Amino acid sequence: STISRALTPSPVMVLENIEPEIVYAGYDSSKPDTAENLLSTLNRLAGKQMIQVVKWAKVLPGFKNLPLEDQITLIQYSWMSLLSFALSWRSYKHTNSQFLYFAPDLVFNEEKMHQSAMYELCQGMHQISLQFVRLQLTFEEYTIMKVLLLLSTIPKDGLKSQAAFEEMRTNYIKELRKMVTGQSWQRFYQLTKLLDSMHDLVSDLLEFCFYTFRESHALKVEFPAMLVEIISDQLPKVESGNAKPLYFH
Numbered sequence: 001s002t003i004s005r006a007l008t009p010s011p012v013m014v015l016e017n018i019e020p021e022i023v024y025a026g027y028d029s030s031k032p033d034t035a036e037n038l039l040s041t042l043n044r045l046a047g048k049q050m051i052q053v054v055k056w057a058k059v060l061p062g063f064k065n066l067p068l069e070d071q072i073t074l075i076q077y078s079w080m081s082l083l084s085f086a087l088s089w090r091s092y093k094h095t096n097s098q099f100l101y102f103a104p105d106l107v108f109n110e111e112k113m114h115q116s117a118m119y120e121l122c123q124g125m126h127q128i129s130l131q132f133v134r135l136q137l138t139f140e141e142y143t144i145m146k147v148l149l150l151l152s153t154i155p156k157d158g159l160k161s162q163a164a165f166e167e168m169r170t171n172y173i174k175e176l177r178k179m180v181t182g183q184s185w186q187r188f189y190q191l192t193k194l195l196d197s198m199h200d201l202v203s204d205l206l207e208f209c210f211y212t213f214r215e216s217h218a219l220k221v222e223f224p225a226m227l228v229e230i231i232s233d234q235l236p237k238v239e240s241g242n243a244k245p246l247y248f249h
């Protein structure tokens with residue numbers, strides 16, 4: 001047992017091992033970069049990324065101590081935070097925050113950001129990547145923060161297993177605290193601040209997403225079944241005031 005306990009990978013080590021492989025957009029560079037084409041491509045990429053999110057959630061420590069309804073809830077609430085945060089990370093790691101690195105076959109410069117018709121939302125996410133450069137964010141801090149985003153929104157009256165969620169959330173907050181190890185406190189607070197700031201960015205991304213979804217026929221913006229499922233459930237929940245964002249500050 002002493003050997004067993006000592007060799008057991010730390011939660012952070014597991015997070016590295018389970019991090020999904022970077023996914024391809026299947027961006028069709030032969031179609032013109034109209035807003036309609038780009039947004040439909042982003043939605044298709046979102047579908048493929050959500051496949052990976054679910055797989056990663058299956059094997060996420062603490063996350064299976066949670067009832068199936070709570071797991072589904074948290075993913076539906078936070079999928080946008082997870083995917084936009086991962087975007088900021090890939091942009092930071094693969095292009096030194098020069099570009100928005102959606103996929104290896106789909107990298108946005110300024111021109112694409114304008115063409116997508118969500119220029120300001122792209123800017124918001126790029127700004128997060130530029131903060132990654134200011135902070136020199138580490139993969140370790142990144143993976144923990146991403147789990148904290150998964151646990152950043154709950155039903156206004158709580159989850160089916162509120163105590164286990166609370167326990168799991170505190171453990172990852174602890175993991176973050178241990179990982180940032182005067183200078184220690186300041187980094188931790190800068191990271192908690194960045195996480196908080198994701199709620200406002202994500203509310204704006206969701207607002208655009210929900211709008212585009214409800215008008216997808218007029219807009220000619222396609223959504224894959226994966227996204228149709230998530231948004232169809234999430235939209236009326238979020239709009240009935242059933243979502244509660246958790247803030248550090």
Ligand SMILES: CC(=O)S[C@@H]1CC2=CC(=O)CC[C@]2(C)[C@H]2CC[C@@]3(C)[C@@H](CC[C@@]34CCC(=O)O4)[C@H]12
Nearest residue numbers: 039042043046083084087121122125205209212
């Ligand atoms: C600048 C951003 O943060 S894009 C945002 C995050 C993201 C990162 C990826 O890597 C994969 C692609 C996603 C998940 C986008 C998919 C498309 C989303 C949902 C967009 C916000 C608004 C939009 C555009 C069309 C629509 O109907 O809603 C998502």
